[PDB]
Amino acid sequence: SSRRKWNKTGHAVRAIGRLSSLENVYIKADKQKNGIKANFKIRHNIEDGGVQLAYHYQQNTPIGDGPVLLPDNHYLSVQSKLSKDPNEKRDHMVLLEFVTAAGITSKGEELFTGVVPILVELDGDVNGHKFSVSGEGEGDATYGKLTLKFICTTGKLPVPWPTLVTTLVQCFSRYPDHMKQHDFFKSAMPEGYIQERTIFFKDDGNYKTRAEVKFEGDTLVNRIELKGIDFKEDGNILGHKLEYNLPDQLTEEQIAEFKEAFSLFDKDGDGTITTKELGTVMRSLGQNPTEAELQDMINEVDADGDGTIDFPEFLTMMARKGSYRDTEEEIREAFGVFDKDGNGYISAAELRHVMTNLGEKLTDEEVDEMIREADIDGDGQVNYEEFVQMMT
């Protein structure tokens, strides 16, 4: 009776917790400044327990005089992975990021068709501590992918790296087709835009940031001025009490593998999988589902609702871990897909058949290398056990 009450009440409270802990970047139109406004919350993990909240308030205004796109209300969804370079002696941060736009049922965008080089430069002043950061890398709006390496050019960074992430190129967000007209960021290019923020760290000081985001030649440049005030000396920021990265995250190798796998489905390379492409892939493997069935298949994983599957969605589908029995069975059926004649052994010809039909061109020697990598008993083919050890 008492335990039932405690448990149910706890369930309700935690439910309210999960429902109102959204970390999305919320974007509205700022029609007076002819740009946009944004607001969101960042939750940093504190060493040995706790969370440091950072309230982001944001405004963006066009640099040029050309017409821009003023969006209806929508949001950006962001995934971030922070990592270190073992061969680096300088205070630094390796950053991988995926940003995709949702929330709804130009010339500048043409500048973001392929991979674009990125230069980031920041000069900061937190409680009198001057510092500088230089970063560089690549952005691919197609997949909404960002990959950069930042370095503190003034020695040791006086603030934790995660506090600078949101400050250190939203023009590389992937906007689905039905939302192409709501992309302010790309529409402001090549002239670019000014992005200003106030970031309030709960029970601590705040950042004020002003940034110029524009094309300089072929390079997307983000030049930043940051000013931090009212920070406590032994707070989570100046005291460096924030964790660098999260656990339970996919390694960049996992993400790479999933990226190539996704590339197998994504035929035109527009960064998303349609029913036509999935149907093509399945038809190549001998399965012929109908259009209705294909749409029914897409809808199950189409989280942001656009009738297709982008790369973060594919990532979510393939990172979702079920029961161990589910995994085992998934592997068994996969083996079923590889073993065409159902004779219990995957031959080189069958592996090559599956991979070629998937879209991957590979030679005799490569297929042979794969077989050799898997062939434990050395009989020239891959049985179920070997396949499982290869898949686990």
Next chain:
Amino acid sequence: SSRRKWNKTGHAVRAIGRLSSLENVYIKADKQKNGIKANFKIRHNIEDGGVQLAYHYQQNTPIGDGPVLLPDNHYLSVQSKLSKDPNEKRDHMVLLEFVTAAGITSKGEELFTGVVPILVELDGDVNGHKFSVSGEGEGDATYGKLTLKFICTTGKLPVPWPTLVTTLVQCFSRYPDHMKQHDFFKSAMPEGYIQERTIFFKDDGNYKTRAEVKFEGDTLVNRIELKGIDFKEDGNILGHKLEYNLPDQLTEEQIAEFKEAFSLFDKDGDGTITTKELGTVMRSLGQNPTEAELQDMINEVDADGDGTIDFPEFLTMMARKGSYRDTEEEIREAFGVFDKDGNGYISAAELRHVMTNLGEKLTDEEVDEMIREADIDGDGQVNYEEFVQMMT
């Protein structure tokens, strides 16, 4: 290189696997017979590995002469938990089930407003083996909830219990408001409908079922005739090689707790949570989010897309387990919600405050009992440690 190819190819194949392993019940309109047609797949787990597929083909026709509702294409989503009665010596099956309709952006329904008693009777003949099953329980279309106990009245059941589940009252499916007009099952009441199926077990025999589903007085009765043929003597069915239930499932106590918790949000008791009700709950706890923010909160968990949160959705949200740090932090913040004055101790007055504001009326002695259940050091209040042990 080889491992990269193996891994990515495996990822693609498994992706195709997950995308095309949908277990939903797919419903279309059968305009000639003035009823419906349905098709779906059931995956049974085989002992020591493997899956037994069961292809369900279904047709339903009205019994009465009154007009019925012929739906546009949609589907039913089903969750099933099979359990045993320890105090039962007869061959039996305890069944808990949740069915909710989705897939789209009458007088009979009035018969399903509250809890309705259910009687099930089946006579079967599989490979010459006659048998009978009598089941009884309750259905609540509001939550799409079914709870029954079935018993083999002829001794030992010659087929595995899980093979009879789909055969052993889809009129208790929860149809969201925007889909009320697509509910054929309830519209055919009280006269009811005939439901016929052919269920093909891959590499084995098949079932042919004919059922009468109708009201007899106040009781919803499902009378079934089943005929099984072409089964292999040592197959998964006659050989009883199918597993009874899945692991990694919520116990009926967990489901009960989550049910009461859900009841706290569900103010009008219509089986779903709206933005108004969530806003009411949060306002009672001192938080005042806006309408836009409330909708933004709902949309994050609104899987089947109806602008609200039904009980299976709430179940999915609260059964989704994140990192251990996420759990710990969720508990910490929950404690924050309980501890109003932030003094580090949850008092009886505060617990009562939270619970009363949530909607639960409870007395001094009950709150005292809860405190006493949690109060480890016996100081009359609950600190963070005690709260955590209570929540874990």
